[PDB]
Design a protein around this ligand. Structure first.
Ligand SMILES: Oc1ccc(-c2ccccc2)cc1O
Ligand SMILES: Oc1ccc(-c2ccccc2)cc1O
Ligand SMILES: Oc1ccc(-c2ccccc2)cc1O
Ligand SMILES: Oc1ccc(-c2ccccc2)cc1O
Ligand SMILES: Oc1ccc(-c2ccccc2)cc1O
Ligand SMILES: Oc1ccc(-c2ccccc2)cc1O
Ligand SMILES: Oc1ccc(-c2ccccc2)cc1O
Ligand SMILES: Oc1ccc(-c2ccccc2)cc1O
Ligand SMILES: Oc1ccc(-c2ccccc2)cc1O
Ligand SMILES: Oc1ccc(-c2ccccc2)cc1O
Ligand SMILES: Oc1ccc(-c2ccccc2)cc1O
Ligand SMILES: Oc1ccc(-c2ccccc2)cc1O
Ligand SMILES: Oc1ccc(-c2ccccc2)cc1O
Ligand SMILES: Oc1ccc(-c2ccccc2)cc1O
Ligand SMILES: Oc1ccc(-c2ccccc2)cc1O
Ligand SMILES: Oc1ccc(-c2ccccc2)cc1O
Ligand SMILES: Oc1ccc(-c2ccccc2)cc1O
Ligand SMILES: Oc1ccc(-c2ccccc2)cc1O
Ligand SMILES: [Fe+2]
Ligand SMILES: [Fe+2]
Ligand SMILES: [Fe+2]
Ligand SMILES: [Fe+2]
Ligand SMILES: [Fe+2]
Ligand SMILES: [Fe+2]
Ligand SMILES: [Mg+2]
Ligand SMILES: [Mg+2]
Ligand SMILES: [Mg+2]
Ligand SMILES: [Mg+2]
Ligand SMILES: [Mg+2]
Ligand SMILES: [Mg+2]
Lengths: 286, 286, 286, 286, 286, 286
């Protein structure tokens, strides 16, 4: 037992007001403002938060927060990382409290992406999720964590070694006429992290969030079209996770992938040379 | 495989007659009197008993009895405790027979709470449970054991180490504006033991018993109100176990927590800063 | 829609104290004494009662109480009986209140058995069933009513005509080397009333009561043997209802048939020439 | 409510000993000999019998026995037949007892096939089915009756009118390059009676019996091949009932159709111009 | 993985003809006679046999045959027994073929009961079970093996050590006012072997066989009563396995325990001081 | 975790055009021609292919391709084979790409059958299976792989050792009056590889392919009969896998076994001395 979900993530942004409107109106996320001068939160479920939005930022990813079941797994994984030669820091109580977790360690993946491992998230059971716009349904989180990210890597083999140590499984799932793309899971979500060896100006290529209801995905798509927000890739279904998704611009320039109907992860490695349908390029430059 | 349930407990009381009326009328427990001069039994199910009520007492907990599956697990856990430096005594046949078990060992937890580990409880299949008052339903026991207790500790870290060795799982689940409260499970019951570092005049803070039917919980609540018995904390739902419960005075001064609809234990550590609703203070001094 | 269950019955007895001990210890029925000088009640479930036990009696049946769904069905069946030439009396409020029902009519079946038709039984939801001895389970009642009775008839064809008018279905199900026995249902209970053309000193041959648990039936059987109460017919399984049952003496001389595992009534008429096994004569003269 | 199953049938044979061996070894039916000089019985289930085999016979069908639910349906259908101009006879008790039924009437269908309508078959629950050879499974009977027959008709429209009056449903289901074949159901069995306008030397073309297990059908097929019994039509699946079946000679010259996996009857009329596969002619002259 | 079922057993008898009639008529077992001069077989299911009945015998147990999953488990358990100091013999092909198994080893338990361990039983799928009398149902075998036996032991602790090594689980389950009785399982059958420290003239106290249907158990009971065969213990339900059973004499003097409705084995050790009901002594001297 | 399915196989043929017509018309496989001069593909499902058909061939098996879950299992099994003394070659990227897999190693089994182990098959999710003739259903593949093969062996013990190392389970399942036949599984398919010690001119005795629908199996059988293709063994059911199958000639002379309704593999070794029914010899010389 090691990493069990993508529990939270932090991003930094240059336009917090635009991000609040985008998150609520375009996606249906809930804005939680605790009156902090430099950040606010986005909720998806009973967790106090799933995304921390830092102000005065770089319009990129700040950290991914990977959950382990408890203290025993936290301690075991820490030692495992040390023994394998990785540089980690166990955080003090102030730093853990900043993230609202019971235990916290910080490191960087082989691509330079700041990576946090924690146990004991804060759950606000007294405060049920209340979406930023009316929703037919809710989000798929639970044992699948918040969603998935594709992040920049320079050495795919080293990236794979690192995430394997963290307890992820997966390998090259697409060979695109040849670019190889690798996808890894740490729970039932088909993938939680993925990467290839392509150049990228930003740490974060995209974040995928999953609705329980197709009606919310469709309405989200309609919101993007109505507000003339760039759709980088049109609606389609992935050969790996079988989800219906599209990719749209965020105010930070990296992409959001709203989706629906993701399939369960499998440990039997398969690869494909294309998607089931759709996901055609529309807006260029992403 | 180690401890699998809170199998029995012993308490001592100053007023056995009051305890008989309380147990039967207020809670629906069954009184079994085997004609012993110094004790009687309370039943909840087919077990010969779940609670031993000793006379001429201190109005506090006398022992918690933790079950293991069988002799192999009993022997293994005994040696484990010895190897870790804890002081245990394997009881002879007379002492085992007193508790009506096939094998028995005695120790104390780090807080000084007398702790028994046993295998092979006596089950009276010929003698079905017959509650002390008419019930709509029955009690939740089975693989969840009799209920849960909160007991006094002086060193939470040492307590955690001890119960971890016994096969329990769990950690700090509430941070209350800061008091930290730890809750541990050894089966599907969300918790069977819990504790914090607060001072306490008694070993036992409260015992929780769970009804299968909301109607019995409601009627129990009504019995407390009708008989003007102190309700220390009003009806509410816990963020951790999701049960509907209240807390009322017993004749011994420590609290009973009658409840309904407890959720299954989880190994993924979460924490909260408050309950879902209710559990407001009413009667003070508990 | 007409008669839907055997809702209650009244019996009269010469020895109420013996009947109280018998009902509680031998059968597990609940005694309810409302302080009336001339009667007490036996409960099986949430109904205020299922059996009224009148004192200063004849050790026989006093009345069968047949339930209809509501007032519309009550009125329709009343008129149906009148139109077919049967003599009925619609009872006033005092008489209805005596039986604790909202509407009541009285008549006699063609065999002279006093027959009541009612709607709106009193249900004491606040007062859950509490058996007269510890039980593993409870009784089968609900949409199947309290049980079944075999009652005396002089003209089977006329009896059949009467119960058919009341909404029962069924005919000759046994031809015994030749005695013909007829069995009729008004709900899922395989039969609620049955009869043949044999002579009988009493209105009531037997009453069948059904346990949910085989363990209670077995213990009941053991109670009869231990207390040296006559077993008229030994354990066996009926070809029609497939229940495991035996027949034992009551203090009134007519028989009780405790049983378990009755099958659902069928509208497709079948007959048999014997039972599946058992039901051999033991104590003679019943 | 009218006819609900093909309950029994009678055949007459010239070689009873050959029929006993055939029924037991080739089909797995149970022979019941009640010591009558002129007949024996074949069982398939708990019914006393499903087929009566008369000696000194014509090697053809003697009667089909159609069940109604009870006396009310029996009386109603009798009057219906009379009112429509058909000739029926209500049988006395001796004649009913010969067939082991509670009520019996006799007529002929428009093709001259002797037709009986009855209620109240004799079920020997004390005497479970015991097949004439070891079987993996048993027969499909229950609410589907014993099987189906194809019988001779001279006027298909009149036949249809008659069976419609009896409560059957169905029409032309095959148009074979053109011969029209009509199939009618009276319960979940896809068909219980069928016919066309072709000439036939015998009343009975074939009887279909259905096994619960494919292994028994296969072994039956193997028995026919091993004993060099004519297979008139090879294994195949019918477009209407979707059953896997073959057709083999009986000692009487008409055909048995052993089968497996019949589909539920439908009230929505369909037709086909051929079967799904197989049912090719092998032995000619049937 | 070690012993997974009681696969077969061998007994020797003085009166084979009496045993054939008893097995078929009284129990519904199938007699298979392969024309061997010194033995015949009893079947319960698709296995070639479950019981070997040797002639010219001692009216006692000859061997218990314990199945392991395959060759790897066979080899591992053999070495385990050798390493623990037990005396075993690996049988040659002739001896294995005598038992109709692919691999066979022979030893004796600490009580002197001949004990065989094997893999690869012969299953006659072509030859479905055909009971020796008509049955409503069949036997419970499959992953539960043929039944259970109680056998003589002189040293219960040594017996327990031996069966524990074989992969069984269980301990003292009854303390009878004090006699201790131990019961061990190797699959879902509540127990497959049991023993105490009481003296016994024979190796075998009783064999329990389980019907799928209560109707067959009842009819079996009726057969014993009708044929005036001693019933040593009357119908009752065991506190441990919850089965309805009785105990009757066999022609060899040891007891058969026909039963119905056995519960699943549990690894959590419980004990009782009596049964649920019944099992009263009738015929003495067993 | 080691081999998890028969993922693909390669055959070589002398008449590719005949094989195309045979595969499509007689079996319903899909022909995929990628324009390669020396080979084409047969599909059964979403995999790019299940069978590679090489031209200019020997009318025999060229290779069996055994799948492992992923790279870790591939590497572990490779080392396991090396450590046990087997000769393996890890293939370069060109060779892996030829088979359309992410990782590939080559060896020979002890019988000389070329054996490939791979991970990461190419799945064409964009290109759903389209059978070569209309089908009622599809093929059974998924976690059961493509089917099973019987291949030539010279030393059954060495063969068993090799496939055991690969993670297969199974042993002798038939003893035929004596020829011993061994059957091994690596997933839920009852067997994926089988063999005996009989002489064979070809590596491949037969390939079994399984339909989801009996109607397709029947139609396939009909196609063989219509086109006068040799049926070596007639329809029957295997005692081990319980499937309905027949065996027919392919254009290469080795046999295809089309079938339906295979049972789940079991780890508990059984043997038989014959099939359930059928599988009688028809066309000789196979
Ligand atoms: O390393 C792994 C992490 C998670 C899963 C997993 C968990 C639940 C469902 C599906 C896959 C599988 C893995 O091999
Ligand atoms: O420009 C990019 C396009 C696609 C991916 C990508 C998508 C899925 C998995 C791995 C990488 C990453 C990129 O930086
Ligand atoms: O979640 C994802 C799953 C699959 C692909 C993908 C599919 C085809 C080509 C490139 C990327 C991209 C994703 O972001
Ligand atoms: O130490 C442990 C003891 C018991 C359970 C458990 C058992 C059943 C359901 C849920 C949790 C989980 C544990 O980690
Ligand atoms: O006065 C007290 C109040 C609350 C708890 C408590 C409740 C739940 C878990 C741990 C400690 C313990 C106390 O002694
Ligand atoms: O069973 C229990 C679960 C949770 C709490 C609790 C909740 C909030 C604050 C303090 C204690 C107390 C309990 O007795
Ligand atoms: O007159 C009738 C009364 C009751 C039922 C019935 C109701 C429920 C289940 C089974 C039979 C059927 C009848 O024909
Ligand atoms: O002496 C009697 C014996 C049996 C029945 C009886 C039992 C079942 C149905 C109908 C009548 C009625 C009697 O008066
Ligand atoms: O409820 C009953 C069901 C069937 C019979 C019966 C069975 C055989 C012969 C006589 C009566 C008697 C009953 O009291
Ligand atoms: O006249 C009819 C007789 C029987 C059925 C029937 C009953 C059960 C299942 C399917 C069809 C449908 C009819 O229209
Ligand atoms: O020679 C015959 C061939 C076929 C049928 C038949 C089969 C099915 C339905 C209706 C008639 C009837 C015959 O007399
Ligand atoms: O039960 C039957 C269902 C269908 C046909 C049939 C099918 C095609 C042509 C002719 C008869 C024949 C049958 O005996
Ligand atoms: O040694 C053992 C052998 C068998 C079972 C078992 C298997 C299936 C169901 C219940 C218990 C449990 C054991 O501890
Ligand atoms: O005479 C005897 C009576 C009972 C048992 C027995 C029954 C169950 C378990 C263990 C021993 C064994 C005996 O030899
Ligand atoms: O299978 C058995 C289960 C339990 C007992 C038993 C129960 C009470 C006292 C003595 C033996 C005896 C058995 O043969
Ligand atoms: O070596 C083995 C490989 C596969 C299975 C298996 C997997 C799924 C279902 C049934 C058997 C069992 C084995 O012992
Ligand atoms: O001629 C042959 C006949 C049968 C098998 C065979 C079939 C199943 C399993 C193992 C071998 C192999 C042969 O070479
Ligand atoms: O898949 C198969 C399963 C069983 C046998 C078999 C059965 C009996 C005798 C010989 C081979 C042959 C097969 O090809
Ligand atoms: Fe994505
Ligand atoms: Fe609590
Ligand atoms: Fe009755
Ligand atoms: Fe037919
Ligand atoms: Fe027993
Ligand atoms: Fe095969
Ligand atoms: Mg994946
Ligand atoms: Mg917890
Ligand atoms: Mg009836
Ligand atoms: Mg039809
Ligand atoms: Mg046990
Ligand atoms: Mg196998």
């Amino acid at each position: 037992a090691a990493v069990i979900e993508l529990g939270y993530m932090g991003i930094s942004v240059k336009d917090p007001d635009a991000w609040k409107s985008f998150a609520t109106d375009m996606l249906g996320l809930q804005v939680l403002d605790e009156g902090e001068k430099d950040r606010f939160y986005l909720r998806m479920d009973y967790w106090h938060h799933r995304i921390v939005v830092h102000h005065n930022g770089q319009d990129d990813l700040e950290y991914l927060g990977w959950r382990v079941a408890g203290k025993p797994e936290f301690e075991a994984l820490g030692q495992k990382l040390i023994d394998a030669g990785y540089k980690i820091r166990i955080c003090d109580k102030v730093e853990a409290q900043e993230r609202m977790v019971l235990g916290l360690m910080k490191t960087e993946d082989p691509g330079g992406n700041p990576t946090e491992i924690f146990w004991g998230p804060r759950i606000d059971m007294s405060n049920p999720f209340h979406p930023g716009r009316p929703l037919h349904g809710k989000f798929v989180t639970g044992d699948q964590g918040l969603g998935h990210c594709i992040v920049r890597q320079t050495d795919v083999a080293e990236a794979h070694k690192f995430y394997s140590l963290l307890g992820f499984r997966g390998d090259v799932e697409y060979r695109i006429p040849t670019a190889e793309l690798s996808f890894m899971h740490c729970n039932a979500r088909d993938h939680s992290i993925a990467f290839g060896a392509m150049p990228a100006a930003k740490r974060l290529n995209h974040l995928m969030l999953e609705y329980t209801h197709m009606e919310d995905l469709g309405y989200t798509h309609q919101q993007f079209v109505k507000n003339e927000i760039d759709i980088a890739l049109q609606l389609g279904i992935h050969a790996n996770d079988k989800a219906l998704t599209f990719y749209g611009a965020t105010p930070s320039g990296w992409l959001i992938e709203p989706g629906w109907r993701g399939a369960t992860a499998i440990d039997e490695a398969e690869y494909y040379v294309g998607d089931i349908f759709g996901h055609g390029v529309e807006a260029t430059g992403y």
